């Protein structure tokens, strides 16, 4: 089997991407944030605290003849950005782009943090990291990919995010029309539960390539590109007027600037991030100071190949017995 779904930016900055997901019988369609940085499928629901729901589409398990309460199970997640949610669990039929999983654990939110309430465009998350990070207790649950894998034509999914435009999540097959050149695969460590790999280096704009190992994770659920302070400093040093601002919380730059590209290595291959992909607009409405799309990972504990980077590539998440990651230009 295979599945193919369109993923759409939630706003004009590509702050995140939502993919429609069918849950239950009859289907209830919710727009979820596919996150290869986490491993919980959770949704806004008829159980969520009233005051914490503002615009979201909710899952109502009582209206689904295939929903079953997973007795005693609870879940609680805290993301790297300080956001969080928690609640109880059902199993139900979940379909993504024509691909169906029966008995998928659907984590029903009773509580969500302010930042989730405040974004009416995201109805929940669908995690695509390794199930070792799943937060369900006392019986840890499998991710959608994990549940479908044996059934897929090939045990893979692919992320094809667009820049200021919709893209595609495919399951069980690689679309050889969606990229240029060849796909370069690279080793993954599953030790921390993430799609963790090692980039071979970078270049700034038309700069020379610097050979250097950068360990990080492929994270579709993180918007920006978070790299070592040295790297980030070398990038913003090419933009006149750019500065690290503690008060805004990162590198900002004059909105009148033309940003240079950023290249990262994948083995002997190179992925080029165009300068415009690194512009995240005024720091506040009407400001002529713009927020940078490349930021320091110092203080995070890990480097993150966030959407800013992934959207410049066609990315293969190969969940074979020994997982690997694949990157192609497009
Ligand atoms: O919290 C996030 C992303 N976040 C995920 C939940 C929705 C809002 C965006 N960043 C993040 C993502 C993966 C990480 C990490 C931090 O530290 C380690 O792995």
| Gyration radius over CA | 20 Å
What count of structural domains? 2
Number of strands: 24
Largest sheet geometry? 7 strands, mixed
Structural classification: mainly beta
- Output the number of helix runs: 4
Strand percentage: 35-45%
Indicate the percent of residues in helices: under 10%
Principal-axes geometry comes out as globular
Strand order of the largest sheet: 18-17-12-13-22-14-21
| Distance between the ends | 25 Å
Order of helices and strands: EEEEEEEHEHEEEEEEHEEEEEEEEHEE
Report the bound ligands by name, code or SMILES.
Answer: N-(1,3-benzodioxol-5-yl)-2-(piperidin-1-yl)acetamide
CATH superfamily (homologous) name of the largest domain: Acid Proteases
Q: Which topology of the largest domain does CATH recognise?
A: Cathepsin D, subunit A, domain 1
Per CATH, the class of the largest domain reads Mainly Beta
CATH architecture of the largest domain: Beta Barrel
PDB class: hydrolase/hydrolase inhibitor
Keywords: HYDROLASE-HYDROLASE INHIBITOR complex
Assembly: monomeric
Entry title: Endothiapepsin in complex with a fragment
Task: From the structure above, extract its key features.
330 residues; mainly beta; Cathepsin D, subunit A, domain 1; 7-stranded mixed beta sheet; 6-stranded mixed β-barrel; binds N-(1,3-benzodioxol-5-yl)-2-(piperidin-1-yl)acetamide; disulfide bond; zymogen; EC 3.4.23.22
Q: Could you explain the architecture of this structure?
A:
It catalyses: Hydrolysis of proteins with specificity similar to that of pepsin A, prefers hydrophobic residues at P1 and P1', but does not cleave 14-Ala-|-Leu-15 in the B chain of insulin or Z-Glu-Tyr. Clots milk. GO terms for molecular function: aspartic-type endopeptidase activity. One of its GO terms (biological process) is proteolysis. This is Endothiapepsin. Residues 17-328 form the Peptidase A1 domain. The protein is mostly beta strands and 330 residues long. It has two domains: 5-174, Cathepsin D, subunit A, domain 1; 175-330, Acid Proteases (Cathepsin D, subunit A, domain 1, Beta Barrel). Helix content is 6%, strand content 44%. The protein has four helices and 24 strands. The chain has helices at 114-117, 144-148, 229-236, 307-310; strands at residues 3-9, 17-23, 28-35, 41-43, 68-78, 84-96, 99-112, 124-127, 156-160, 167-171, 184-187, 196-204, 210-218, 225-227, 243-245, 250-254, 262-266, 269-273, 279-282, 289-292, 294-296, 303-305, 314-318, 324-328. The strands form three sheets. Strands 18-17-12-13-22-14-21 form a seven-stranded mixed beta sheet. N-(1,3-benzodioxol-5-yl)-2-(piperidin-1-yl)acetamide is lined by residues 35, 37, 79-81, 83, 217, 219, 221-222, 300, 302, 304.
């Amino acid at each position: 089997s295979t599945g193919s779904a369109t993923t759409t930016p939630i706003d004009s900055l590509d702050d995140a991407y939502i993919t429609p997901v069918q849950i239950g019988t009859p289907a209830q369609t919710l727009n979820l944030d596919f996150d290869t940085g986490s491993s919980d499928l959770w949704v806004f629901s008829s159980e969520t605290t009233a005051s914490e729901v503002d615009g979201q589409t909710i899952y109502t398990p009582s209206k689904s003849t295939t929903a079953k309460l997973l007795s005693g199970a609870t879940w609680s997640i805290s993301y790297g950005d300080g956001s969080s949610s928690s609640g109880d669990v059902y199993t139900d039929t979940v379909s993504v782009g024509g691909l169906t999983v029966t008995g998928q654990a659907v984590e029903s939110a009773k509580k969500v943090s302010s930042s989730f309430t405040e974004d009416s465009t995201i109805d929940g998350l669908l995690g695509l990291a390794f199930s070792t990070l799943n937060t369900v207790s006392p019986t840890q649950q499998k991710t959608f990919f994990d549940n479908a894998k044996a059934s897929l034509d090939s045990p893979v999914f692919t992320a094809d995010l667009g820049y200021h435009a919709p893209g595609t999540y495919n399951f069980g097959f690689i679309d050889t029309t969606a990229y240029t050149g060849s796909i370069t695969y690279t080793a993954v460590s599953t030790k921390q539960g993430f799609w963790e790999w090692t980039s071979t280096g970078y270049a700034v704009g038309s700069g020379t390539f610097k050979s250097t190992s950068i360990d990080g994770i492929a994270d579709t659920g993180t918007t920006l590109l978070y790299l070592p302070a040295t790297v980030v400093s070398a990038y913003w040093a090419q933009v006149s007027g750019a500065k690290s601002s503690s008060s805004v919380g990162g590198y900002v730059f004059p909105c009148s600037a033309t940003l240079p590209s950023f290249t990262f290595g994948v083995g002997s291959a190179r992925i080029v991030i165009p300068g415009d992909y690194i512009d995240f607009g005024p720091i506040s409405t009407g400001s002529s100071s713009c927020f940078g799309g490349i930021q320091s990972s110092a203080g995070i504990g890990i480097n993150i190949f966030g959407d800013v980077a992934l959207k410049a590539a066609f990315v293969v998440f190969n969940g074979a017995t020994t997982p690997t990651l694949g990157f192609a230009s497009k």
